[model samples]
Target: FSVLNWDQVSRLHEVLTEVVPIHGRGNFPTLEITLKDIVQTVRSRLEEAGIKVHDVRLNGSAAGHVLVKDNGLGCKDLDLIFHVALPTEAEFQLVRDVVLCSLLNFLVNKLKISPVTLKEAYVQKLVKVCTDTDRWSLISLSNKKNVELKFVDSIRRQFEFSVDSFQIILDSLLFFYDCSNNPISEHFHPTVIGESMYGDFEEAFDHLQNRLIATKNPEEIRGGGLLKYSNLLVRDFRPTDQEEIKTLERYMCSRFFIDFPDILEQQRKLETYLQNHFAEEERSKYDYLMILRRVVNESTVCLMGHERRQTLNLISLLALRVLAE
Candidate 1:
């Protein structure tokens, strides 16, 4: 017995068209139920018509069409095959292209990985296969089938690459910070105020460094002192410095929510400190001062406001002019 005729196919098409708009909105929960109901209703009707219906499957997208495939036993060695006007391969390719563009934008803008680098790093082999005309057309069909297989693996690889890139940038920033601790002070001239600002430079430096180490928390490393010191190092960075700085700044902001809860207050204090301590005109003379001022005004708003000993030590060490000629 034939499971479907012209009337049945028309009815199925009507049902699919009705559900297409709703499914296209991506309400998966509701769409799943609607699909099941359609399948069940069709299967029941076919079975009641004395047809041996085994199962019914609904496939395809919500762009106004669907493919309903029914598997069943037929009499006299006959079989039933039915197809609705489904989305073409071009339609599927359009959707895939849209998604790939969005993914590339995210990786490039947020993760700071260039499009060329991403293709070279993860998708090189796939891309080479996709570009060759003869080979591409043959494998295009297979590519459609393998979209699900490649998607999860690509996501994992991108995530791993992003993490590795972030770590490398962070390590470079930390190294810069370690070196700038001494040199940053030289920019500011020594005076009585700088001298009385903190006592016993050696003890204070030791205490501050020891306290930072003792905390054993990487997040605690961000503050006005470190920000000022890092400014010195970053000024001399190479061509790719800005991207690395952006990544490090994002990482620092993430930690600020927990490590420096009073970020706004600290920002205010740092601004006041800069304003009151340094002359507005002379501030531009020293590279470190200008960089620190810019960083304090914009990027390092989460840095601590209070006179962290680490900060005071820099002031004292610079005041003593031990490293000065």
Candidate 2:
């Protein structure tokens, strides 16, 4: 019946605290120093290139302490955005090279950056470019865990508002961590956290509270491209059942794996069969469904009559919905 476990969460919080800037005013000595170096250099160079930098925004996991399990170990990118009001949005169109060269040149001579890269710089309509990859994804620069120096020329951030979507202004001479200061509590509505900081995009907090993930963007979930792909993958995940997890933990503490042996085992048995056997790793929906049907049919024999039929009737529609999607 429980959704979250205290022990698991404490462990996760510690894991984040190890590498991420959580707790208090969110200042790490080494990281702050490094960010200063980047900010100072970029600001100085952009001015020399005759580009007035409006703002440099910092996004990604580092901004907020919502680090992913296992993957949170310093895989954080410096998701920085250089929000410049260029002469024309199309100015970077023809003069992209000169502007980038100005920024890149500072990397080698002034900042002592090595192995600076330029990722797949695309040639698309100015509108499409602004909304999607824009100049940053095109000119993907590197080092300091790869600086995500994006060139945002009058464009909105192309995603939903999240606790992590908060951006830090590098221009402040302090890497300003302007994020939601919401203390996560199951007692309150999840939107309490979101609306407290951003009443506009107040949704994703409670989703973060419980692990059944989705894009907060109401449009993207119903819609393709990498956005939809990411949504699907995020949707695919299931959170741990706090009850079952406690039993497992109980079994861990006591050497007896059989406290409520019969019921617990049947629950595990069905889950395992569906996970190991019923799973089709299939494109052809007919074959895929058929293959899945057999595994469940055989496994559910242990469920006897009433529970067996109930489960199958539901599983039938559940798997069918997958096909429709």
Candidate 3:
């Protein structure tokens, strides 16, 4: 493979665009306010029904507007988590009250961007109620398709990526009104969105900017690192998992153009993982491409958040690894 022409450059760009996809900046002003209103309404309704809310939070790709247009991926829901005093305790009643208030004028009939109602703003019928659980429900936007209202409790380490963790607490507006926003790398106004649990607001943005893929609670850490080792990393997934295969290759293939001590350290962590990983297993039993696949899986997770991969010189990295003491 000698030096290529412009067409190859375009091809590389296309491939780079895929495995390392970046979602759009999600902070449209009208959309932000509408999201806030929906949260505020849900909070007020829950309180009216006498549900004491610790807080209501917005998280996920939609919350940050970093919706990566990936295959087989469902449209991102406007995921809302209501951390409350009671749960399992009165899920049915809470779901009923949420559904009832959701049907009211605030969200569907009257939520507005100054002149247009939410229904009119997007020119769509916006409510489809489904009881996903005895514990919860989803108010999906029927016409627009992308906007979904997911209300739930008792979920774990909800922050999958820094992008997902870019949360805005709306009642925190009603906390400032009382109070008062990606990995996509576009600028957003925090006051317009609400308050972020990550420092003031920029702390959340800082994570996005750094492309940090990490665990919020130490308890979420699997095996040793962030990749769900039991599900993703632990599997060979070589035959049926074309998606994982493609993603792993992309991470391995993105092959490090950008660099910082930060990026190198991530690679070092993987290398160290392999070192410590097999060193102990030496007394027991073990494997090569298998370890590489797991490392690539870890790298793929990192690449989603915009982190650089471990190596371009896989030949040497591999060659030396086999013989290292």
Candidate 4:
């Protein structure tokens, strides 16, 4: 087909402005835009926000702004962008509309830039991180549907168990703080506190630990738990100094406590929903662990800070896998 004409271009822009579907293999667009592309675009646009640009470049350090690089593109980049041809100006307009629409959608729905708040920032960060992580694992598990289902089931079960168990741990932690007669250790230890504390905190914590062992078990949950693995990586919360503790407390007060509880509660609901939907008597717990592991692994990767290129790579991988599946 010939390139889209002006009228078709207008229509393409309208479609871009609105939402329209084009036939492609993937679930999401494999747009040619890279992180570097985006950064450059944003930078140039911002400079051009009130001015103009002709390949503007800056050097050295600056007080007001900083330069960032996006990893360069590969051969597969363009292949994905124009997988479906734009036949007319209307179609081109639709494409433009889609691009502009998506940008607006991202700003309003995803980024929520207008009424920005710290909580919003944190939530967006966390959501994007988690979404990226899920995307990666979903990509990995695309061809392995059965394995994926099993993994997801295991995640639901294990998470439910862990959260239930953590409640007991929380109680134990509180109890350890309350006790007066038993001497507190120089460095707070779970074992020492469990033994020394007066209330059921010790009993609860120990029982919870044991329950964890009896349930999915950390060793079984590690490394996607497919090939008989042990020891999952866990971030231990510890502060080297009181200042750190205070900082942590402040952070918790400002961000964690305010947002975390609700987020966790929603997460629990989601877990329960998954369990109801995916978990079946026929599914092996081990298989379930695989699915869960993929998700958790992806989650960790997503939460980790990554360069724009890395982030785009992850998203591209996810989009492709999701489409393939």
**Whole-model Cα lDDT of every candidate shown, in order:** 0.28, 0.38, 0.40, 0.25
- The lDDT leader among the candidates is 3
Per-model TM-score on C-alpha atoms: 0.19, 0.39, 0.37, 0.20
Please write out the lDDT profile of model 2 over residues 1-325, one tens digit for every residue: 1122333333322422343221111121122124434455655666666777777655554443322333221334455567765555554643354434444433212223222232122111112254443433234332223344456765543553343454444343222222325543334212211111223333443434443333334332221122222222233333234344333222221221123134445445434433322245323333434433443344333434454455455446645665676
- Write candidate 3's Cα lDDT for 208-247 as tens digits: 4444333344333332333222112332222133455454
Clashing pairs in 1: none
Q: Please report the TM-score between candidate 4 and the true structure.
A: 0.20
Q: Of the candidates numbered 1 and 3, which has the greater TM-score value? A: 3
Model 3 has how many clashing residue pairs?
9
Quote the RMSD, in angstroms, for model 2: 17.0
Tens digit per residue, CA lDDT, model 4, 209-247: 332211333322322231111111121112234343333
Q: Write the per-residue lDDT of candidate 1 for residues 225-255, one digit (tens) a residue.
A: 3443333233342212365555445444334
Query: Residue 210: error of model 1 in Å?
Result: 28
Give the higher-lDDT candidate: 2 or 4.
2
Q: What is the lDDT of residue 7 in candidate 1?
A: 36
Best by TM-score: 2
Query: Against the true structure, candidate 2 has what lDDT?
Result: 0.38
RMSD in order of candidates: 30.3, 17.0, 18.8, 26.1
